[PDB]
Design a binder for these strands. Structure first.
Lengths: 91, 140, 46, 100, 185, 140, 71, 97, 65, 64
RNA sequence: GAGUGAUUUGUCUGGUUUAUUCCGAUAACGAGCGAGACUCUAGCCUCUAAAUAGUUGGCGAAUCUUCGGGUUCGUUAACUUCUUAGAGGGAUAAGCGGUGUUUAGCCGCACGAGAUUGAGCGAUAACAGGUCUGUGAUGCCCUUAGAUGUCCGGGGCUGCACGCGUGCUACACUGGUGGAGUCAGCGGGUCCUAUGCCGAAAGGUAUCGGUAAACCGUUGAAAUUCUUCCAUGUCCGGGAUAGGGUAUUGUAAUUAUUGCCCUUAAACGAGGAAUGCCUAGUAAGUGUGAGUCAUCAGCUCACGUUGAUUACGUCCCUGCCCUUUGUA
């Protein structure tokens, strides 16, 4: 989480689910910054990945979601700003 | 060559009317206006002529090509195209006063004679047989 | 003729011309019913 | 002869960019270019049950892919086409030439 | 401007609504004088838009019930035209006038609601609606499993309702409703 | 000014007159089993009219006046809804032998040629003449 | 109770049709069948007979309904 | 287009003769309800009680040879492979205990 | 036996009834020198200016609370 | 419904404060000036902003 | 800030909004997610273009004609109205009246194609909800060759005193039967199949064209429209059940794959207690496409065609949201 946030992401969400402590499964969620969930801008600003880990007790699922920053140059993130973000030209 | 082209629309039926300087001819898909099916929906095609006057229709030859939709939709599209073609002819080759009189008569009788009805079928959604209806729910 | 479990013995009479062999060796057993159990009906479900 | 340039894609922006590049090349060369002819878009729909099992309410995903096609008619016997075709490229758009 | 006549046979400008209450809820003349009772119009966008739908249009709309006959507005319009012709051929005056009289006569003026019931008055719009519904239901029930056609049953129902005789299903139901409401006052 | 073609007259009267003329000509050879068959699977009984062959040929000619077509196209044209008993109805094509025989009889009478591109049948140079003559006879 | 409707006219029903039916303001197969206890098909056949003879004016001639009036 | 009561007797004899000998009057073999009989091999139309007699004979033959169809026929069950779990019930509801 | 009294709806108090199917309306008698005003319960849709035909007019509905 | 969200309200407030001179009483004029003075990612959003700006102008004329 | 603390306030008295949507008040200030915005879709209208789309002609042709015109093919120019798909415009509570706290907004009018088109996405926190039978996703347990691996041959998953759920077909003249006449859209194809010929049908046969705005295909669908017979009769409603014959798929059709021909022709006369879905191009009726597919649709996912009655409300029933209140 700290590395992703330092890398310039607006927000990050990491979920680790499975047999982390004891027989009964649980899910641990770590959230930093601001993250969007609904709407088309999700496709442009949100980048997700899912993976699995096979440990002695069983399988643990890892989910990572990163909200990219608004990059006008179109290198670190989407070139177009969020639809509801109105930016004002200073006079 | 005095000629205008208009179109009437209804559901999916669309009729394109070519109206030119003529001798009072009314044709749709090459057939007279008095031999269109269904038979009851023939006064609907005659309404423009009845309301406005054949005296101001005999000077033109208007040919209507209708396709799509069903019988009622095509009849309504044809009548709308007829009215719009007459209005366009009077706008492009007759005085704006007669144009306004024409429009006033048609609108006063029926608004759908000049402006298309925007209603179209609404898409079906799963979990039911149609747009809004849902399959029977068994609670037990 | 094999019926799926055993070999049903059948003599071929002239009356069996034009028929499949399987039609003379029933593959199942006729059903004789047994006083419906608990799940039958809705009153006995409880 | 008539050279047919057919451009196909699943995204409209790259396809239109490539079309505009080709028209600009033809006009600069002073060729007999026929404007971009826009074929009806092809919609491939797949409707599937969301659940991997048979349980729960019956919910469906409606996936669809769109294919857009552009035609360009050229009257060009000279060596200019290879130049125009080679200069302008863009990912996601597939182009092919036919000697109609 | 030429005078508009329903089916090109019946005049509307000579029709009068006796009930001043329903004058503004039974559209017959002026803007309501339409040649055909088949006009594909939106009469449900707002609440009272249906009040402007022509009365013969309303009768045709309400005749196409019992989904066996759902969506068959052309067949229903034919039925209405035949019934009107029978009306004129049997009585002698304007069939549209006969229809207006039947609608005026078939509307219950007091009903019952669950506020045991309480007697309440009936709005003119509901009066016209229920009159049309009762007439159509009576015609349908009379025509079902009968040699008499739907057109003849509708003609008889409309004539009886217009005359106010206690032979029409609509008049009988109106009397039943008013009597029950009077008892429940 | 009017009633110079088949399209300018009612098609019911047009096909009636065409069948009447075809019967009068006496050059049409009705097939042997005409009174022995159904006109398609969707039908339940044989035609009530014993002269159904002439009416079918007249309808074929009247439609060929409108559009060139083939045996399969006319099978679709004369097909209809078939009731499968307890299952819902479905579209079903008509028979083919009757249409083929009627078309061949019209070809014999020289009322139908083959399409120049060899893609069906077209109303003949004489077929158009005869049908337009019948239409103007209808006149009125 | 079943409708015991005759399929072809008796002589009494025939002259009844030729005397009184022509005097009705409203003439239809249904009403004629109800009055004379005949099938609707027979009623309408007799009505075509009357129309051909010119004793009745046809007002409606639909396949689903036919109406006649006194002439 | 004529009621059967108006028809005279000789007409009825004509019609019954045609029915009993359809092949003579150019009625094709595909128009008959008993073609290529399994026993005799003749193609004819079974009229009146002949239909019931032949149905009885067919059922007797199948049952006697112990065909699956005959056994089902004689047990009283459906013979065209229909599901019999839910439909075809014409008995009395049976309770539990 | 009370004369058929025709009354115009001056204003609509509001909806009423178990399911809100009735409407309370203030009604003014048409042919009435004193211009009698009362409150009535109505069935079906009603708006200002609608004319109701009260079979008997002595009854008055209870004002909405 | 027709209740303007805080996004529209804040955008209208900022635009009125920073470009009062260019804001007239005409909806089309406000739309035009918004088009050039602000980068708005949706035409409906721009029209909502312009409408609320006109509505605010009407009150500003009456008083603070 | 308040409490020792669990926890509270922020996250509200009030008004308003589909909305924790806004106005505003305020021991809180400043923020995030969700809502909204957003993407696709439906209109209605102006620039780009169109030998895979079309029109207006011009030119030949061949019919009719009441002689003035109508229909019809086969084609070289002008143009995009129609068709297609890019780029944009357009609608927002902006204008008028009333109302409202000089608000938020609400109601009506006007202008208008339109003064809430339908979908997709969709928060925190949870369920011992379903899925180990989707998976070279998987822990542990079991089994590992007289296998619980794999394959091969048969049978079953359809078996029938009975109960329940989703459905199809009907109970009829607002109809059924024989004619005649005509209007779609979504979309699919190496397999679609045109068109000839044969056959009563089913289907058979020689194969054109197409890997597609080019051919199937101007997708001649149904309901519906006009006529003929039938007329209240379980009958020309209904077509379950069953017999015989016969095409096609497939290695194979028995436990009938399906269809086609003749025959048999049952219950059903509008359905008790109960109970479901639904607010406009909607319900309902009506057929078509696709998925499944060697063959088999009464199922599902979509498409159009014909097209309404009723209401524009309420919290009575069933529930949901917020606040106060009581609780063992």
């Amino acid at each position: 989480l700290r590395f992703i946030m330092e890398s310039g992401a607006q927000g990050v969400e990491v979920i680790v689910s499975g047999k982390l402590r004891g027989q009964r499964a649980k899910a641990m969620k770590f959230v930093d910054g601001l993250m969007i969930h609904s709407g088309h801008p999700v496709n442009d600003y949100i980048q997700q990945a899912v993976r699995h880990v096979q440990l002695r007790q069983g399988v643990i699922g890892i989910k990572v979601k990163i909200m990219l920053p608004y990059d006008p140059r179109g290198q670190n993130g989407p070139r177009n700003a969020l639809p509801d973000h109105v930016q004002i030209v200073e006079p | 060559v005095q000629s205008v082209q208009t179109f009437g629309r209804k559901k999916t039926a669309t009729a394109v009317a070519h109206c030119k300087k003529g001798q009072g001819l009314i044709k749709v898909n090459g057939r007279p206006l008095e031999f269109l099916e269904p038979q009851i929906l023939r006064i609907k095609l005659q309404e423009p002529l009845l309301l406005v006057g054949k005296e101001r229709f005999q000077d033109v030859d208007i040919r209507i090509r209708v396709s799509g939709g069903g019988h009622v939709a095509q009849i309504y599209a044809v009548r709308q195209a007829l009215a719009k073609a007459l209005v366009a002819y009077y706008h492009k080759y007759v005085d704006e006063q007669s144009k306004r009189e024409l429009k006033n008569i048609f609108a006063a009788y029926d608004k759908s004679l000049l402006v298309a009805d925007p209603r179209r079928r609404e898409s079906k959604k799963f979990g039911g047989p149609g747009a809004r209806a849902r399959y029977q729910k068994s609670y037990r | 003729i094999y019926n799926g479990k055993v070999f049903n013995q059948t003599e071929i009479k002239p009356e069996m011309i034009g028929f499949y062999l399987g039609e003379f060796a029933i593959s199942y057993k006729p059903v004789k019913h047994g006083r419906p159990g608990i799940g039958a009906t809705h009153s006995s479900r409880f | 002869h008539r050279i047919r340039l057919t451009l196909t894609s699943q995204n409209v922006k790259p396809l239109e960019k490539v079309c505009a590049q080709l028209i600009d090349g033809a006009k600069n060369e002073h060729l007999i270019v026929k404007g971009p002819i826009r074929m009806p878009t092809k919609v491939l729909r797949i409707t599937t049950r969301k659940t991997p099992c048979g349980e729960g309410s019956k919910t469906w995903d409606r996936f669809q892919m769109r294919i857009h096609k552009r035609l360009i008619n050229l009257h060009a016997p000279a060596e200019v086409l290879r130049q125009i075709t080679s200069i302008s490229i863009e990912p996601g758009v597939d182009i092919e030439v036919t000697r109609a | 401007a030429p005078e508009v006549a329903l089916f090109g046979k019946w005049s509307l400008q000579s029709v009068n609504v006796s009930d001043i209450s329903l004058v503004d809820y039974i559209p017959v003349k002026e803007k309501s004088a339409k040649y055909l009772p088949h006009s594909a119009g939106r009469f449900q966008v707002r609440r009272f838009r249906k009040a402007a739908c022509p009365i013969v249009e309303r009768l045709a709309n309400s005749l196409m019930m019992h989904g066996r006959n759902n969506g068959k507005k052309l067949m229903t319009v034919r039925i209405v035209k035949h019934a009107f012709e029978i009306i004129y051929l049997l009585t002698g005056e304007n069939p549209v006038q006969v229809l207006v009289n039947a609608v005026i006569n078939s509307g219950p003026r007091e009903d019952s609601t669950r506020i045991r019931r309480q007697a309440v008055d009936v709005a003119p719009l509901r009066r016209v609606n229920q009159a049309i519904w009762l007439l159509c239901t009576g015609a349908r029930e009379a025509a079902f499993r009968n040699v008499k056609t739907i057109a003849e049953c509708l003609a008889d129902e409309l004539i009886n309702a217009a005359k106010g005789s206690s032979n029409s299903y609509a008049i009988k139901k109106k009397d039943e409703l008013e009597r029950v409401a009077k008892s429940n006052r | 000014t009017r009633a110079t073609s088949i399209k300018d007259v009612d098609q019911h009267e047009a096909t009636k007159s065409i069948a009447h003329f075809l019967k009068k000509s006496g050059k049409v050879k009705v097939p042997e089993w005409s009174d022995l068959v159904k006109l398609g699977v969707n039908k339940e009984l044989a035609p009530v009219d014993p002269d159904w062959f002439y009416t079918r040929a007249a309808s074929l000619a009247r439609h060929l006046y409108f559009r060139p077509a083939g045996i399969g196209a006319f099978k679709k044209v004369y097909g209809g809804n078939k009731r499968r008993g307890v299952a819902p109805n479905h579209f079903q094509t008509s028979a083919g032998n009757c249409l083929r025989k009627a078309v061949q009889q019209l070809e014999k009478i020289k009322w139908v040629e083959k399409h120049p591109d060899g893609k069906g049948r077209i109303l003949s140079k004489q077929g158009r003449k005869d049908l337009d003559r019948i239409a103007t006879s209808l006149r009125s | 109770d079943k409708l015991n409707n005759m399929v072809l006219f008796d002589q009494a029903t025939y002259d009844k049709l030729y005397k009184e039916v022509i005097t009705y303001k409203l003439i239809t197969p249904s009403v004629v069948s109800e009055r004379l206890k005949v099938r609707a098909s027979l009623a309408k056949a007799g009505l075509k007979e009357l129309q051909a003879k010119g004793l009745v004016k046809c007002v409606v001639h639909h396949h689903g309904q036919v109406v006649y009036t006194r002439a | 287009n004529k009621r059967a009561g108006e028809l005279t007797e000789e007409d009825f004899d004509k019609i019954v003769t045609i029915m009993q000998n359809p092949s003579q009057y150019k009625i094709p073999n595909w128009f008959l309800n008993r073609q290529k009989d399994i026993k005799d091999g003749k193609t004819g139309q079974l009229l009146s009680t002949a239909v019931d007699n032949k149905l009885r004979e067919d059922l007797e033959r199948m049952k006697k040879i112990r065909l699956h169809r005959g056994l089902r026929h004689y047990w009283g069950l459906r013979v065209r492979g229909q599901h019999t779990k839910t439909t075809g019930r014409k008995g009395r509801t049976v309770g539990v205990s | 036996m009370d004369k058929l009294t025709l009354a115009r709806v001056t204003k609509v108090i509001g909806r009423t009834g178990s399911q809100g199917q009735c409407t309370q309306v203030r009604v003014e008698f048409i042919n009435d020198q004193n211009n009698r005003s009362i409150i009535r319960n109505v069935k079906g849709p009603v708006r200002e200016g609608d004319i109701l035909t009260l079979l008997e007019s002595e009854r008055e509905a209870r004002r909405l609370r | 419904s027709r209740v303007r969200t805080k996004t529209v309200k804040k955008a209208s407030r900022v635009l009125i404060e920073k470009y009062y001179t260019r804001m007239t009483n005409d909806f089309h004029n406000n739309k035009r000036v918004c088009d050039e003075v602000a980068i708005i990612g949706s035409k409906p959003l721009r029209n909502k902003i312009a409408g609320y700006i006109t509505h605010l102008m009407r009150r500003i004329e009456r008083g603070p």
